[PDB]
Amino acid sequence: GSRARVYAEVNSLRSREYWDYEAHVPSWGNQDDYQLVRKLGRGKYSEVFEAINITNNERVVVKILKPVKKKKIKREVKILENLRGGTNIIKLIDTVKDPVSKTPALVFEYINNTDFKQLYQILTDFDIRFYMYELLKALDYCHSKGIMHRDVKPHNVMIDHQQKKLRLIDWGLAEFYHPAQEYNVRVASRYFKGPELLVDYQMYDYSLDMWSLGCMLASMIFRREPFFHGQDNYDQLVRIAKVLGTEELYGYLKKYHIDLDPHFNDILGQHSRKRWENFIHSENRHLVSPEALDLLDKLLRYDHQQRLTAKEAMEHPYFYPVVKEQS
Numbered sequence: 001g002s003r004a005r006v007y008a009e010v011n012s013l014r015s016r017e018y019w020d021y022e023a024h025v026p027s028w029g030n031q032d033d034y035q036l037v038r039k040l041g042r043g044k045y046s047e048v049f050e051a052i053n054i055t056n057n058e059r060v061v062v063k064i065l066k067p068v069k070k071k072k073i074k075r076e077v078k079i080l081e082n083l084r085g086g087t088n089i090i091k092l093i094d095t096v097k098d099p100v101s102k103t104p105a106l107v108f109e110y111i112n113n114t115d116f117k118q119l120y121q122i123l124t125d126f127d128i129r130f131y132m133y134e135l136l137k138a139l140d141y142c143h144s145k146g147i148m149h150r151d152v153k154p155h156n157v158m159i160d161h162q163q164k165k166l167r168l169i170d171w172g173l174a175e176f177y178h179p180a181q182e183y184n185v186r187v188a189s190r191y192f193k194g195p196e197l198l199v200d201y202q203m204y205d206y207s208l209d210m211w212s213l214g215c216m217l218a219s220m221i222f223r224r225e226p227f228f229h230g231q232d233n234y235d236q237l238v239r240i241a242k243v244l245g246t247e248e249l250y251g252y253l254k255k256y257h258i259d260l261d262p263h264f265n266d267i268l269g270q271h272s273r274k275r276w277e278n279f280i281h282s283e284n285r286h287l288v289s290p291e292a293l294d295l296l297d298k299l300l301r302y303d304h305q306q307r308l309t310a311k312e313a314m315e316h317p318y319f320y321p322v323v324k325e326q327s
């Protein structure tokens with residue numbers, strides 16, 4: 001089997017009520033205090049609005065939850081409660097219901113997001129270090145709280161590039177980590193799915209989020225977004241293997257006794273592991289240092305166990321300029 005190298009037992013060591021979200025009873029406040037201003041987006045199970053609290057004029061974001069198992073709602077609510085105060089985790093202001101329909105909604109702090117497509121073409125070297133460090137604070141926090149996000153991607157990382165504020169949003173796929181538990185591999189967005197998901201390995205952990213973070217780092221330093229652009233879940237693994245290597249994939253599978261869907265036989269081909277320097281060219285050279293490549297190499301690894309933890313990544317020399325500035 002497999003276990004997280006960090007925070008493996010932290011839910012076991014807490015009160016059952018911490019992680020037994022099905023038993024959680026939220027306190028549902030009154031949505032009538034909020035005026036919806038504009039639609040910001042629509043997810044598979046929610047729609048999101050900018051809003052104003054009419055009682056105090058606070059600008060907020062209201063996530064109206066579409067009908068789903070109330071179990072999934074309790075999970076997201078309990079996770080957000082447990083993460084209260086966490087650095088760079090979106091702040092849950094309240095849990096409310098339409099007082100007539102009883103439809104639930106989550107009220108979050110507002111962030112003035114700069115859409116990532118334009119932003120990621122204009123970041124400086126220091127900006128990338130800064131924002132990756134801020135995102136790592138959120139991941140180390142949630143991992144330390146026994147929670148895997150399972151959907152790290154640019155669309156879930158709100159960045160106010162004027163105030164230099166970052167928040168990790170959309171905890172609707174997040175789950176509690178318990179050692180030896182088998183999890184659904186149908187999580188994360190295609191381009192950010194770790195190889196463990198793509199090969200149907202269910203005994204994954206916090207390190208899934210570190211793969212996704214590595215994908216984001218690669219896209220920022222190299223200016224190829226998304227970095228691994230699969231056409232489907234099968235092709236996603238092929239795109240990874242064309243960089244990390246096919247023999248290297250097979251060694252990973254063998255180590256964890258992972259069975260490979262035979263449809264991969266016709267599409268993986270044979271590929272040597274590539275040097276990360278191969279992705280450097282005149283348009284991105286100013287963003288790519290030895291430190292950046294060393295960090296990236298330690299995140300984008302097949303073996304989920306040997307990827308850096310969020311804390312190990314934060315301690316890497318790549319972030320020394322950020323730490324010194326935050327003196």
Ligand SMILES: C=CCOc1cccc2c1-c1c(c3c(n1C(C)C)CCCC3=O)C2=O
Pocket residue numbers: 040041042043046048061063090108109110111112113155158169170171
């Ligand atoms: C214009 C962008 C700002 O958007 C914000 C800002 C603050 C807080 C949140 C969002 C947000 C949330 C959620 C979603 N957005 C957006 C991306 C549409 C979509 C998926 C579900 C979700 O939770 C926030 O919590």
